[PDB]
Every structure is written in C-alpha cells, then in structure tokens.
Amino acid sequence: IVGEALEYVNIGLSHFLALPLAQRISLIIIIPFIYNIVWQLLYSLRKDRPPLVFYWIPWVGSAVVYRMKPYEFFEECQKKYGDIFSFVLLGRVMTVYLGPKGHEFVFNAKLADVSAEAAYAHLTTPVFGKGVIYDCPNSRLMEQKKFVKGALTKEAFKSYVPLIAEEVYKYFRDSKNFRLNERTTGTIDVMVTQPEMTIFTASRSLLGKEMRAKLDTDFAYLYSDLDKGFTPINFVFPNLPLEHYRKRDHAQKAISGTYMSLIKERRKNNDIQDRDLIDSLMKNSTYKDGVKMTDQEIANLLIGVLMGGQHTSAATSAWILLHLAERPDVQQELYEEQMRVLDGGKKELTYDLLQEMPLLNQTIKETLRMHHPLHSLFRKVMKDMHVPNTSYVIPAGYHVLVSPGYTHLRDEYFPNAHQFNIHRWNNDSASSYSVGEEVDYGFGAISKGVSSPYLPFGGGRHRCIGEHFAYCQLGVLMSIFIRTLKWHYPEGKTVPPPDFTSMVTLPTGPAKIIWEKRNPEQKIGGRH
Ligand code: HEM
Numbered sequence: 001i002v003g004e005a006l007e008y009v010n011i012g013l014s015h016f017l018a019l020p021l022a023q024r025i026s027l028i029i030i031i032p033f034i035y036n037i038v039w040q041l042l043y044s045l046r047k048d049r050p051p052l053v054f055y056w057i058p059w060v061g062s063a064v065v066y067r068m069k070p071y072e073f074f075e076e077c078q079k080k081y082g083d084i085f086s087f088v089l090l091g092r093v094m095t096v097y098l099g100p101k102g103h104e105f106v107f108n109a110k111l112a113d114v115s116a117e118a119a120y121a122h123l124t125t126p127v128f129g130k131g132v133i134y135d136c137p138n139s140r141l142m143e144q145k146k147f148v149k150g151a152l153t154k155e156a157f158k159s160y161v162p163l164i165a166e167e168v169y170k171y172f173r174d175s176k177n178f179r180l181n182e183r184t185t186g187t188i189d190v191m192v193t194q195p196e197m198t199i200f201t202a203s204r205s206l207l208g209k210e211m212r213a214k215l216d217t218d219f220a221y222l223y224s225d226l227d228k229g230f231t232p233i234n235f236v237f238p239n240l241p242l243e244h245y246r247k248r249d250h251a252q253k254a255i256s257g258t259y260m261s262l263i264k265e266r267r268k269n270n271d272i273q274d275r276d277l278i279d280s281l282m283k284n285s286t287y288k289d290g291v292k293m294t295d296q297e298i299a300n301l302l303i304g305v306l307m308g309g310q311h312t313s314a315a316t317s318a319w320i321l322l323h324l325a326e327r328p329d330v331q332q333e334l335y336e337e338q339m340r341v342l343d344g345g346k347k348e349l350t351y352d353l354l355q356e357m358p359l360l361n362q363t364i365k366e367t368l369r370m371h372h373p374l375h376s377l378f379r380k381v382m383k384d385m386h387v388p389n390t391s392y393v394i395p396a397g398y399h400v401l402v403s404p405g406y407t408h409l410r411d412e413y414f415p416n417a418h419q420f421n422i423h424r425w426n427n428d429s430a431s432s433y434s435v436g437e438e439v440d441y442g443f444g445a446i447s448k449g450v451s452s453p454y455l456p457f458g459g460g461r462h463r464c465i466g467e468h469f470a471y472c473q474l475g476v477l478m479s480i481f482i483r484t485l486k487w488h489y490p491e492g493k494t495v496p497p498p499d500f501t502s503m504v505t506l507p508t509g510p511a512k513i514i515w516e517k518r519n520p521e522q523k524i525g526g527r528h
C-alpha cells in the first residue's frame with residue numbers, strides 16, 4: 001500500500017501551511033537558496049553550455065563584483081574557465097566571449113541571432129525619447145545613423161574646428177575653473193571641467209549657436225537632470241515614482257521641445273542651410289520606404305547622439321589630462337609637434353592641420369586603449385546560437401557580452417598593456433582602420449572583419465559613427481590645452497582608478513590637476 005504515502009504527502013502539505021510565520025517566511029528564503037545551488041550543480045553537467053560562474057544569492061548573481069571590478073572579474077573567470085563563460089546578472093544570464101574571437105561572435109553576429117535594442121531599449125528610450133535609436137527596428141536605426149553621418153563630413157569638420165576652438169578659448173576666458181586673463185595658475189577637477197567643455201563644444205558645432213546660447217541660462221539645469229537619467233539603474237528600475245525620474249522625463253520633454261521649436265521655426269522661415277546637425281536632419285531624415293522622421297523623432301535623435309557623445313568624449317578628455325598630468329615628457333613632446341605643425345603658433349588650427357599631428361592623435365588613441373569608456377557591450381540572444389569550434393550553444397533568452405576594452409589591457413596583444421605609451425602607435429595614428437574587406441549595413445562602408453584586438457568604437461552594424469567627430473573635438477581641445485597650459489598632479493596624487501559603476505568608465509573623482517599658463521601674459525580677446 002503506497003496509498004498511505006500520498007496521504008502523508010497531503011498531510012505534510014497541510015502541516016507545512018500551518019507552520020509559524022517565523023518558520024514559513026524562512027522557508028521562502030531557504031528553499032530557493034537551496035534550489036539555486038542544486039540547479040547550478042546540475043547545470044555544470046551540461047556540455048552544450050559554457051561554464052557558469054557560481055553565485056550564492058539567487059537572481060542577484062555575480063552582480064556585485066561585476067559592477068565594481070568587471071575586468072578583474074573577467075580575468076579570474078578567464079583563468080578558471082577560459083574565454084567563454086556565463087554568469088548571472090540581476091535576473092539575466094550573461095554569456096561572455098573574451099578576446100578577438102569574442103569580438104567576432106558578438107559584433108558580427110547575425111541580425112536574426114542577436115538584438116541590441118532588446119538589450120538597451122530600457123536604458124535609452126526613457127532618456128532620449130520614443131521612436132529612435134533602440135525604440136525602433138534595426139533598419140530604422142541603420143538609416144538614422146546614415147542621417148547623422150551626413151552632418152559628419154570632412155567639410156563639416158573644417159567648419160567645426162574654428163567653432164570648437166572658439167568654445168575652448170571662451171571657456172579658458174570665462175569659466176571660474178580657469179579665468180586665464182586673471183589667473184596664471186589654478187587647480188581644477190577634470191570631472192567638472194571636461195563635461196562642461198564637452199557640452200559647450202558639442203552643442204556649438206552639432207546643434208548650432210541657438211542651442212549653445214541656451215546653455216548659458218537656467219536651461220542648462222535640464223541637461224543636468226536629463227544627464228542624471230542616463231544611469232545603469234534603468235536596466236533594473238526604468239521608471240519609479242521618484243523625483244529623479246520626474247525631472248528626467250521633464251527634461252526630455254523640455255529639451256526636445258526646444259529642439260522642435262527651433263526646427264519648426266527654421267522651416268517656418270526656410271532658414272534651412274548647412275550649419276549644424278539640425279539643418280542636416282531637417283533636409284535628410286526620410287527613410288527609404290518614404291516615411292519621414294517627425295520633428296519629435298528628429299529632436300529625440302539629437303538628444304541620444306549628443307548625450308552618447310557627451311559621456312564618451314568627456315570621460316576620454318578627462319583621462320587624457322590625467323595621464324598627461326604625470327607625463328611632462330609627453331606634454332613636452334606634444335608641444336613641440338604643435339610648434340612644428342602650427343609654425344610656432346602663427347598658423348590657425350584647421351581640420352587639415354589636425355591630421356598632421358600624429359602624436360596628438362596617438363595620445364587619443366592610447367587613452368582610448370587604456371580607457372575604453374564602455375567596458376561591456378550587450379546583445380540579447382534571439383535564436384539559439386552555436387559557438388564555432390565548440391559544442392557550446394547559447395540558448396535564446398541569454399545575453400551575450402563583448403568587452404574589447406578588456407582585450408585592450410592584455411599583454412598578449414599590447415605589450416606592457418598597463419603602461420601609457422603613445423609611441424606604441426608610431427606610424428599608426430589613425431583613429432582605426434579596416435585591415436581589409438568592407439561591408440555597408442546602411443550607413444556607409446565599414447570593416448567586414450571585427451577581429452582587431454583594438455576596437456574602441458566597436459564593429460558591425462552597431463559600430464560607432466562619431467569616431468571622426470570625437471577625434472576632431474578631442475583634437476582641437478587637446479591642441480589648445482597643450483599650447484596654452486602645462487599641468488601636473490598635487491603632490492602624492494596619481495592617475496585615479498576607473499569608476500566602472502557609472503554609464504561610462506570615467507575616472508574616480510575628484511581627479512584634480514594643477515594647471516599653469518605657458519604664457520602668463522597671454523590674454524584671450526572678446527567681450528564678457
Ligand atoms: C571617444 C568617443 C567614443 C567612443 C569610444 C565610442 C564608442 C562606441 C562604441 C563601442 C559603440 C558600439 C556600441 C555597441 O556596439 O553596442 C558606439 C556606437 C555608437 N556611437 Fe559612439 N563612441 C564615441 C563617441 C561618439 C560620438 C561623438 C557620437 C556622435 C556624435 C557617437 C554616436 C554613436 C552612435 C550613433 C552609435 C550607434 C549605436 C548602435 O548602432 O547601436 N559616439 N560608440
């Protein structure tokens with residue numbers, strides 16, 4: 001008689017529901033904790049699954065150590081498991097593929113295999129607005145990148161350089177962090193100055209003088225509000241009844257409203273020329289099926305492009321300053337190149353002369369090697385993927401994680417990878433370059449292979465299109481910094497460690513440097 005056994009099942013069930021509040025809620029804790037550890041041991045038996053990093057807390061997973069020290073977490077998992085391993089992250093299963101072959105597996109994955117918008121829609125749509133970037137089919141994103149790229153030509157860069165130069169000098173003249181007509185030395189926090197110089201130069205060139213003029217008013221507070229809304233918490237809590245989320249959404253409406261106001265006003269006057277990205281998108285935002293971007297979608301695309309380039313570039317110029325602060329030899333070498341190329345300062349900086357400054361461009365290139373602003377890039381796996389030359393299968397619902405910034409710091413591909421050395425790029429100052437064949441995904445021909453160990457701007461269909469703008473912006477800025485100032489650390493201070501917890505791997509602040517004028521008597525003209 002096993003009939004008695006099922007009776008005692010039912011009996012035991014009723015006795016379970018009659019356990020005290022103390023013991024019951026403890027079982028709601030211990031029974032998933034126990035089952036968590038059982039499932040993992042059964043999981044490590046599957047040979048079609050990459051090894052899974054062990055974790056105690058269910059759902060949370062390895063979130064704590066990945067959030068704080070991802071590159072150290074990756075190297076430990078690489079020593080233990082190899083280049084392909086999975087780990088649980090806040091309810092998601094992340095499959096990491098390290099190395100150049102990991103770059104190929106993710107950046108060159110089939111459009112039907114992975115989705116970037118499935119991974120990033122919650123991070124960006126609340127900040128940027130609806131209809132653009134990752135709130136649309138990939139084919140729409142491909143053409144949006146094509147639209148933006150139309151205002152990112154060599155002709156545009158020739159006009160942006162004197163505009164960006166004016167903004168840098170205006171900042172040297174007017175900002176409390178410098179005031180070079182009143183002070184010959186001072187101390188700045190680079191995480192204060194660089195975001196400000198980044199938005200001032202990006203707005204003036206990409207958005208135009210009207211939008212730049214707004215930043216001198218209370219309107220600049222909205223950018224700060226919207227900027228605060230670009231944060232990793234959106235991956236878990238995209239919308240919560242809080243003040244942070246309200247000022248963010250308010251900023252998005254208010255900022256996009258200002259852009260639409262200018263857009264509708266220019267078309268109201270046929271004041272549509274070739275000045276900025278706004279003119280460009282007004283003349284060139286019709287998809288190939290005939291659908292035209294709305295004024296709201298155009299404005300939202302402006303926010304996303306400007307916000308993305310804001311964080312990557314501001315972090316990068318901060319890192320450049322921090323590495324040069326302890327390298328007066330490099331500052332000295334960069335200065336000589338400035339005197340040679342610009343004829344002792346008698347030549348005005350142009351976009352063509354920027355291209356004749358290899359050491360300056362190598363400095364940017366080396367900084368982007370040691371400080372990739374995006375330490376990890378994600379895709380959600382849409383169809384079950386097989387890893388070549390393995391038996392591994394990444395089932396749909398998993399996420400893949402590619403990390404070129406980790407390969408940037410491996411000695412095998414960059415000897416003495418943790419040494420800052422711009423001369424490792426001698427006779428190779430190009431921001432990046434295709435090492436052979438090419439492919440066009442809808443926004444221009446780009447490298448077909450994505451196997452380079454150096455991928456600061458990614459690769460494949462989601463490859464960056466701001467690379468040449470960033471080098472232009474960083475180049476003009478650093479050319480002026482070099483010619484105007486020397487700088488160094490306060491005694492005992494050095495390059496800070498990266499903050500991997502923010503949206504980009506910016507330096508841990510406050511990161512202070514002491515500037516001093518190369519020409520104490522030099523004055524910056526203009527009224528103020
Ligand atoms: C140092 C500066 C920058 C770096 C290192 C950088 C890096 C990257 C990387 C790695 C990606 C690939 C993202 C992925 O595959 O998921 C990307 C995408 C992109 N970036 Fe940049 N970026 C920089 C600046 C800029 C600027 C200045 C702009 C615009 C003016 C810009 C606009 C874009 C756009 C539109 C994409 C396309 C994203 C997609 O198609 O999914 N970026 N960037």
Ligand SMILES: OC(Cn1cncn1)(Cn1cncn1)c1ccc(F)cc1F
Pocket residue numbers: 120124133304305307308309312374376377464466503
């Ligand atoms: O790729 C980003 C979004 N992102 C991914 N991981 C972290 N943030 C950042 N970015 C890359 N280059 C510039 N910004 C992006 C892409 C396009 C875009 F329009 C905005 C935007 F934030």
